[PDB]
Amino acid sequence: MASRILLNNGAKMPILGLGTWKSPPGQVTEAVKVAIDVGYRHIDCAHVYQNENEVGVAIQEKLREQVVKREELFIVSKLWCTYHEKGLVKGACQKTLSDLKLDYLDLYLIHWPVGFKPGKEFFPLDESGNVVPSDTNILDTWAAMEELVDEGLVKAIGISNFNHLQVEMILNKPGLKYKPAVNQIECHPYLTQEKLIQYCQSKGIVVTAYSPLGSPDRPWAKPEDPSLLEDPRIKAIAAKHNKTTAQVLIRFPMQRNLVVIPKSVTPERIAENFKVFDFELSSQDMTTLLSYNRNWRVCALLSCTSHKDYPFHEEF
Ligand SMILES: NC(=O)c1ccc[n+]([C@@H]2O[C@H](COP(=O)([O-])OP(=O)(O)OC[C@H]3O[C@@H](n4cnc5c(N)ncnc54)[C@H](OP(=O)(O)O)[C@@H]3O)[C@@H](O)[C@H]2O)c1
Ligand SMILES: O=C(O)COc1cc(Cl)ccc1C(=O)NCc1ccc(Br)cc1F
């Protein structure tokens, strides 16, 4: 299994990265240091995660120590929903760059296809709990992302949580200058995403799978929810291969030509999760894991469901 996938901007992206959503600020510096020490070269970040400064301390220390060169790292961040305005995109990107201690990002994503009212609050609400939209559409936001490439702030741009029709809207944009390089979407055996993945791959867009372990630490988890890590059938495939369930769950998307970004702040799990280049799931294993699809999503949010661009009404 080759470690990197070629993007449509001509750059190579490591297929395994470290996720950072929910990584506590007092733990994420060590997590990222350990990750880089054990071989990770891709870190998935976002301003809304509120820990980019601490991620950046780790990146900078490892660059200073000459554990890695900047060109060997692939750092991803995301434009939050309250910065879908022309006049706000550059400053949002620059704040992320300053926090991460970087002079460019390898990839910058529109985090959700959904613009909110700008201001201090990440989820501005009306008095009845609906998110307050921005009138700023995904095409105008995309043009602002293209400008970041042309200013040298980012090497690649992409999208996240865009449905089929929204990806198509970008591809069909009048005057489109740069195609999205990546669409980062939730994907795991309970949400297998065959339709959207095939569409994106057919257009040369690389798909990154988020929440590949089913996000057991998501703050809205309920006791009744299905659990990938505890699913005895997945455990059975893992046992057959003498690997952990998490390792199977990480290798699965890799064999679909996806990038995958498991999160951990536990050093032993960070290392575990990287040890996925030395075994292969059979085709039968792959089809069996695909068969577990239930259309079950970690990431959805009631307060945003009436926004005109909320992505999960549409089928794929
Ligand atoms: N674009 C978006 O909208 C979006 C949305 C969601 C996620 N993401 C990105 O994708 C990343 C991954 O998704 P996620 O954070 O939702 O969840 P995840 O990676 O599916 O699961 C993370 C959870 O699994 C645990 N874990 C990690 N390795 C394990 C192992 N080997 N054995 C047992 N448990 C293990 C972690 O615990 P410990 O940390 O305590 O070890 C944590 O509780 C995020 O951090 C973020 O970077 C992006
Ligand atoms: O969005 C992510 O990356 C992970 O989920 C969250 C992370 C943070 Cl720090 C805060 C909140 C979420 C979170 O609630 N994400 C879900 C979400 C968000 C926005 C929209 Br328009 C739809 C939607 F389903």
CATH class: Alpha Beta
Number of strands: 10
Report the order of strands and helices: EEEHEHEHEHEHEHEHHEHH
CATH superfamily (homologous) name: NADP-dependent oxidoreductase domain
Q: What strand order characterises the main sheet?
A: 3-4-5-6-7-8-9-10
PDB class: oxidoreductase/oxidoreductase inhibitor
Keywords: T113V mutant, oxidoreductase, NADP, Phosphoprotein, OXIDOREDUCTASE-OXIDOREDUCTASE INHIBITOR complex
Assembly: monomeric
Entry title: Human Aldose Reductase mutant T113V complexed with IDD388
Describe, in plain words, how this protein is organized in 3D.
- This protein is α/β, with parallel strands linked by helices and 316 residues long.
- The protein is 34% helix and 12% strand.
- The chain contains ten helices and ten strands.
- It has helices spanning 25-38, 52-64, 86-100, 138-150, 164-171, 194-202, 232-240, 245-254, 267-274, 283-290; strands spanning 4-6, 12-14, 18-19, 42-44, 74-79, 107-110, 157-160, 182-186, 206-210, 259-260.
- Helix 2 (52-64) links the parallel strand 4 (42-44) and strand 5 (74-79).
- It is globular and about 55 Å long.
- It binds NADP nicotinamide-adenine-dinucleotide phosphate and the ligand O=C(O)COc1cc(Cl)ccc1C(=O)NCc1ccc(Br)cc1F.
- The site of NADP nicotinamide-adenine-dinucleotide phosphate has 32 residues, from helix 9.
